[PDB]
Amino acid sequence: MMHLKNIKSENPKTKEQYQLTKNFDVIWLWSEDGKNWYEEVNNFQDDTIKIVYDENNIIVAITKDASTLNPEGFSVVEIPDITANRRADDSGKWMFKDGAVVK
Amino acid sequence: MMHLKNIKSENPKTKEQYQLTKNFDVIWLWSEDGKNWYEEVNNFQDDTIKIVYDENNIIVAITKDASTLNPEGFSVVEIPDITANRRADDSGKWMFKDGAVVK
Amino acid sequence: MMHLKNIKSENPKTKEQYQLTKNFDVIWLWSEDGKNWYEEVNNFQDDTIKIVYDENNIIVAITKDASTLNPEGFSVVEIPDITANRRADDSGKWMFKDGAVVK
Amino acid sequence: KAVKIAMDNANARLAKDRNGADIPNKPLFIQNLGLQETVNRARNAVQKNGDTLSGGLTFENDSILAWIRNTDWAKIGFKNDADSDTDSYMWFETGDNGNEYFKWRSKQSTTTKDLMNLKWDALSVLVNAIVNGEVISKSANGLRIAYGNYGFFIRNDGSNTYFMLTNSGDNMGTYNGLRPLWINNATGAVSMGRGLNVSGDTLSDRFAINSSNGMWIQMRDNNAIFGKNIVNTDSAQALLRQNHADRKFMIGGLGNKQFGIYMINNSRTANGTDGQAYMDNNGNWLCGAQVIPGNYANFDSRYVRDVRLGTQSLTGGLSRDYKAPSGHVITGFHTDDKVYIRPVQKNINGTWYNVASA
């Protein structure tokens, strides 16, 4: 499913992005593959788990609503909402590697 | 005077409350007796002391403007603004039981 | 350049300030010489360093955009953006006295 | 018998006591006397108690043919002083009371039809009058149709020409107070004093309302252009229309519900309109699309246009109890255990203000 890695801030690229940064200081976020975070939010599924993990793949944030995330400096992956994934909490006791792992 | 106990969040009950929760994510608060916190704010007196205390009746918050409160999980009581009540601070050194007590 | 000392909050003095405090709770800030902080913001230069220091002249905040400051209880001075001034950080390791000093 | 010759001679002569009875050839006697032409002219003489003529009669001087009776008369004559006479005329005259008049009539078998009477005050033509030339009156009330209940006439008083009406039952009378239509003879301007009802289009370069001045509520009664037929409730009626190349714009309304400006593109075929900007029955102003002001100041002064966190500062690393200053939140730590803080800020109408802490 949706997977955006190494989301980092970069200058607005288009006129509409330029207006929003000029008038509302919008900091546009882009994944290392060039996808704009704010426009890709609508492509997430509504009832899936959205994971935020660091460069070392420690999960630091979990949600079901991707628009509540600020993934500047992190990665976001969408995973199915299963019992094996509901056990992971926002603490540093769970990592991600094609799935959630214990410790 | 005004006294709302065990104010807790519950789903909007009316159409206007449903619109505000749908559009602005309003979390509607209700006291254990069924009073809506946000509509009862206008019934507080302007120049009285408003007390916020926990289930153990420890006073955690004090104000003269009830609209500045978020009493989710607490109780609110309105008391007259007297010298014996101006000594209570937001620390856990004052309780409430039909009045403010020392320690 | 711009230098506002002992900026403190005082009641609105004019009708337009009175409306903004009445409707939006604006806390009007004034320097000890009677200058209104919010109207003097536009008189700062765009590419200078703006310093915030306490009564003991310890620098507590630095910026290039004065409108991002809340100088209630502090002083603001504008200094030229030089290499000798870019070394000062927001920590308490730099003071101000007609310039930035080490320790 | 010598005297018998004298006796026979005397016996051959006209006897006094016989008084011409003894004339043997009386027509010859008349002839010899010289009386034949007298006989012939008296035989051929028009008689004073009436006669028939086989030739014409000619008056050679200024003589009159007259009927004279009861001190009154009818007369024909010929006025002519010389060949160069510039006022010469055959005249017909009646007298002597002013009311003896002239009549022309014709007969078909025993039926008589009077055709024309000429009296002291009027020529009365009892038939039609067909004039090959022009018909001109030199009286102000020059042309009249006196038929039935009301008479109609045209009055030109030298300054204005009026279309005039009499009162009822007085079709030969003067005008009443009605002024249906008149013309200013000097300027050509047409006026109408009793209103105007046109079937079809009334085209004019400009329309001028005799416009009114008064109180707000009197706008109901001000002089205006208006729809004579009320707009039915929930039905559409336009009163003013401007055609553009590809669309038409209307001022109109939905009965009891809407009034304002509507646009219909010429390409539309389904019922409805392409643009609407109108007042409803509560006095609101509604637009089917956007309302775009050139100046937003009265809106921009009502709302938050941005929120942000201001510049980070550090407190003095201090006591076991600490409270962040007004408007500030904690944003970090430095352990002399210091804490980072930032001010929350709101942008109202283009100025960044610091948020307040209750």
Next chain:
Amino acid sequence: KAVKIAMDNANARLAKDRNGADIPNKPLFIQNLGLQETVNRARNAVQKNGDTLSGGLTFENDSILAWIRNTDWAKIGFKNDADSDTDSYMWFETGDNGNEYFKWRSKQSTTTKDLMNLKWDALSVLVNAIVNGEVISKSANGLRIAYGNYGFFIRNDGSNTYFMLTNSGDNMGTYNGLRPLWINNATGAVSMGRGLNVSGDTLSDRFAINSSNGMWIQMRDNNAIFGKNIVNTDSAQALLRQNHADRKFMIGGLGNKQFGIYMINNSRTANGTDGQAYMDNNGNWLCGAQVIPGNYANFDSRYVRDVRLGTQSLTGGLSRDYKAPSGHVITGFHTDDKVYIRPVQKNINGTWYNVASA
């Protein structure tokens, strides 16, 4: 010779066999007979086969001058029963088929010009008719101009006066179905049945549109005031104007682009307008300046009007792991290590609500 005296005496006497031829002085004989006046009156007698007169003729009783021929006639007489006769007249009469008529003509050298004929059904004036008095018809179709292709006439039927037209080639005929203009004889109201075209200004107290009722899209065709000339694309055209002391307001448009209300101050000299409020070709409502409602409720319910931090509270000094409640941020510390918190609040439409934490 005594009988010679008797013989000579007899010889001196009128001889029967000579039949007056032996009268020595015949004019004296006529005189002595008493016949001179007979001679003189017969010499001076009008002759029945025609004559010339040097004096006038007078009828002293009710006698007629007649031309009688082929059982038809022309007659002149004088009707007068007494001096007080109230219907006395000189009359001219023709008979006896109804079609014998009256003609007046004049001669200039050998040229004859007929001037007027009077017949059973019409006086025909072959020249102009100039009437010093008033010209009045008592027929409904009272006044007609029968010239060329179409006749024009005024018909007053007693109730309404019409301006009437004939069909083509029938200028003496009845009216057709056209009603260009008529007048109500009782009320004075003017009506026109074939439209009206005015050059210049048409001024009226009020203008009444025979207004329509129907569907939205039929507003294109409702009866209205409209501009006969389309507004050219990107050109300006006003259809309604109100003058104020210092400015003028117009309803009009920019062709295919704008339609609405425009203000021009009288002091302006450069091209443009001083105020604009109008619909564009997409149905938006635009104003060159501010749009100022009296009630902002439909806007105030859409936006945040203020943000603030609410009242500070203290948690229970507790565990090694802590999370601030929904909507709250950390604003201080108390070391039993307590922490200060405040709720973030937003003002929507005049109510302060607590912010939510996802």
Next chain:
Amino acid sequence: KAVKIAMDNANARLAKDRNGADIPNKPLFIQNLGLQETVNRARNAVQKNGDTLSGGLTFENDSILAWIRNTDWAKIGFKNDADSDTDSYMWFETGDNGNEYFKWRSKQSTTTKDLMNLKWDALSVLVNAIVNGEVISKSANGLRIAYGNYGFFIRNDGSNTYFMLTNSGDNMGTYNGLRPLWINNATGAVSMGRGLNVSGDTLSDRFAINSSNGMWIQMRDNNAIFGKNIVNTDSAQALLRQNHADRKFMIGGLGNKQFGIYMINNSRTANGTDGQAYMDNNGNWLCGAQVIPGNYANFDSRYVRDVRLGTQSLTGGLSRDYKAPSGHVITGFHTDDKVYIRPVQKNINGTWYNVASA
């Protein structure tokens, strides 16, 4: 004495030398001669130097009554070729210069009143002309009122019927350039070339403005419907009105202050209006109630519509110095001493954006 008998016999006979003087009974002599009827007809003979008649005169053939003098004349005759003659007439004729004419006059005591003259070019009626039939002209300038300063006439040229005016002092003259009113004879359409002024209501199915095209500032002068009377400053004047069942809507204004749309409910009695949407003298568009667009995009893009705290995350439990990332606040702790943080978020135009930290 035998010859005395012969002498006495001769003496009893008519004497030549006495020339009838010795006739004893002269009336008997005339009788015996056969001359009595000659005597009687000459005694009763109309005399050529004038006479009175007690009976009528009849012309039995085609004979003329004439007045002939100075080579000119007046004549009466009767034209009739047979009883079936289809052009038979009594005629009156003058000659021989064309200007000898016909006059009718009447006398009251010694006063003479001329009533009618008929000349080569015109019948002149010096009194009124009252026609029971129809009055018809066959000339284009058929009907004229030549009274006072300006003449008025109706001209039907076969294609159009005009109401015409002469120049001043020329009331018998041709038309000038004025065209107050004319009718199209083929279509019935009424036109007016010098404007129109109506008292009261002008009702029409449609009103067509001869509308203009030009620059913005020329809208002051475009052809339009307008108020002839300026609206007084601070006074109300409506120019257009639409009636609904329970209310009326007006286009109008407050002088120098307001112009637009006003609604007055029929139940209102106090002065004022029930709805207002109008331009003021600065070009703003004002509404007494709400302004409700169908699309809010140009407003929703200006303001914050919501604020919230986003999802909580945990840092790595780390150094003695820490700063929260951009847009974030501290919301908790975990003691390897970790700290909880949340991002502050703002909703602009339906998208949640993260707040920035200066």
